[PDB]
């Protein structure tokens, strides 16, 4: 049995910042989604265009697992038709998204007493992100006459900020690990099926 390697995504030691979110392509494998419970304690999920109870019956052309960390009160932005600072500048789901969004509290792993400053998000952008677009630029935006020379300052704006997750925050400000499962269905032979099929 050649199971899809969902463990690589869900049990990754460290997750990506949302601005630099990771993508794992899942093809040519049997998708046993039941393994998600073994890796994500107390997870929550929403699905769009698929019923979760029939996932082990369905076949798809390819599957994509995108993963990253955001704070709890931003998880609602990871849904089709949403706008906000994460949806607009960091990670964007299309209105017609077919897939599931899985999120779980990672305070124990991703908070630090002084703040975890390794997880970042983008503050501003020339235009909103397109569906599944990824912007990892760190260029300081030069608004005035004086060149910035990689130094933030007057008229020189850093595009990214740290979350600074600390274990003393309420849940809305605690870190959540998020995996977005995309179920791609082309008019083409399926390569990812559930174990039942």
């Amino acid at each position, epitope marked *: 049995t050649n199971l899809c390697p969902f463990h690589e995504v869900f049990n990754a030691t460290t997750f990506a910042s949302v601005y630099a979110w990771n993508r794992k392509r899942i093809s040519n494998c049997v998708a046993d989604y039941s393994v998600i419970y073994n890796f994500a304690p107390f997870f929550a999920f929403k699905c769009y265009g698929v019923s979760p109870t029939k996932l082990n019956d369905l076949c798809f052309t390819n599957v994509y697992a995108d993963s990253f960390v955001i704070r709890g009160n931003e998880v609602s932005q990871i849904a089709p038709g949403q706008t*906000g600072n994460i949806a607009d500048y960091n990670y964007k789901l299309p209105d017609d998204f077919t897939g599931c969004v899985i999120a779980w509290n990672s305070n124990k792993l991703d908070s630090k007493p002084s703040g975890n400053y390794n997880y970042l998000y983008r503050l*501003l952008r020339k235009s*909103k992100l397109k569906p599944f677009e990824r912007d990892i630029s760190t260029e300081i935006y030069q*608004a*005035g*006459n004086k060149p910035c020379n990689g130094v933030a300052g007057p008229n020189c704006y850093s595009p990214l900020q740290s979350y600074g997750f600390r274990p003393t925050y309420g849940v809305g400000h605690q870190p959540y690990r998020v995996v977005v499962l995309s179920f791609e269905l082309l008019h083409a032979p399926a390569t990812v099926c559930g174990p039942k099929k």
Partner: antibody, heavy 123, light 111 residues
Framework: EVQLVESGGSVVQPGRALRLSCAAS????????MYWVRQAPGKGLEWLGY????????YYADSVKGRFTISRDNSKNTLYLQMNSLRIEDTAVYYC????????????????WGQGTTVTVSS | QSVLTQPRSVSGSPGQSVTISCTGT?????????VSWYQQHPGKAPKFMIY???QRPSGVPDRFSGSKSGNTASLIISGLQAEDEADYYC??????????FGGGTQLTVLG
């Protein structure tokens, strides 16, 4: 330090129109979304609307939507408010303000304000 | 969106803490963390004091902080100073790229 200067406030009769301007010093204007906010005498701030740094979008409070038009001329470092169908209750100090961050930002706030220009709508 | 509800006035002495509430609906203050606060002295333009509920823009004294619970956000001023005497306005995102201000609170510093 960008300076913002509103102008054009005056006494106007109900039913008529008035155009306000907001001139920005320096060259940074073209990088920033701009806003209009007003304040009736003795009353609170009222958010009126926004135009993006590049003109890509304009948004309006329901209280002025379909009466007021916001526009900008980046070649003149100038923001405008075209006010039509004026009512007594439009009497206020009118402020322009720039976004705290350049480009598309929106979720943070308004960090530089003009001193305001005074509009009095009265018969 | 309707104006966000603030108390008309609050008072404190130098060195004390003072708090101002900002109550909205489940589709503005209760739906978003984009809640900001402004300070306005007599005859002057507002000054940007807080964003994202509890973040301070560049230069604002660390004495200003915030918190939120459901439809109500809070401005918390520790170590009150004479210069803090001013009107304070909350403001919230209301969906669909619309913002709305609260009605204002007059803060007096007993001097």
């Amino acid at each position: 330090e960008v300076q913002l200067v509103e102008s054009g406030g005056s006494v106007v009769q109900p039913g008529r129109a008035l155009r306000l301007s907001c001139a920005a010093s320096g060259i940074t204007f073209s990088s920033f979304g701009m806003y209009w906010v007003r304040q009736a005498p003795g009353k609170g701030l009222e958010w009126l609307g926004y135009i993006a740094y590049d003109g890509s979008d304009t948004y309006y409070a329901d209280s002025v939507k379909g009466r007021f038009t916001i526009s900008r001329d980046n070649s003149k470092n100038t923001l405008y408010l075209q006010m039509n169908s004026l009512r007594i209750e439009d009497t206020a100090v009118y402020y322009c303000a720039k976004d705290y961050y350049p480009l598309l930002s929106y979720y943070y706030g308004l960090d530089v304000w003009g001193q305001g220009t005074t509009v009095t709508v009265s018969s | 969106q309707s104006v966000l509800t603030q108390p008309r006035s609050v008072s404190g002495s130098p060195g004390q803490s003072v708090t101002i509430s900002c109550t909205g609906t489940s589709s503005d203050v209760g739906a978003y963390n984009y809640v900001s606060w402004y300070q306005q002295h007599p005859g002057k333009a507002p000054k940007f004091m807080i964003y994202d509920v509890d973040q301070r823009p560049s230069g604002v004294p660390d004495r200003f902080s915030g918190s939120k619970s459901g439809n109500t956000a809070s401005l918390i001023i520790s170590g009150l100073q004479a210069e803090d005497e001013a009107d304070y306005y909350c403001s919230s995102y209301a969906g669909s790229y619309i913002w709305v201000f609260g009605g204002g609170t007059q803060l007096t510093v007993l001097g």
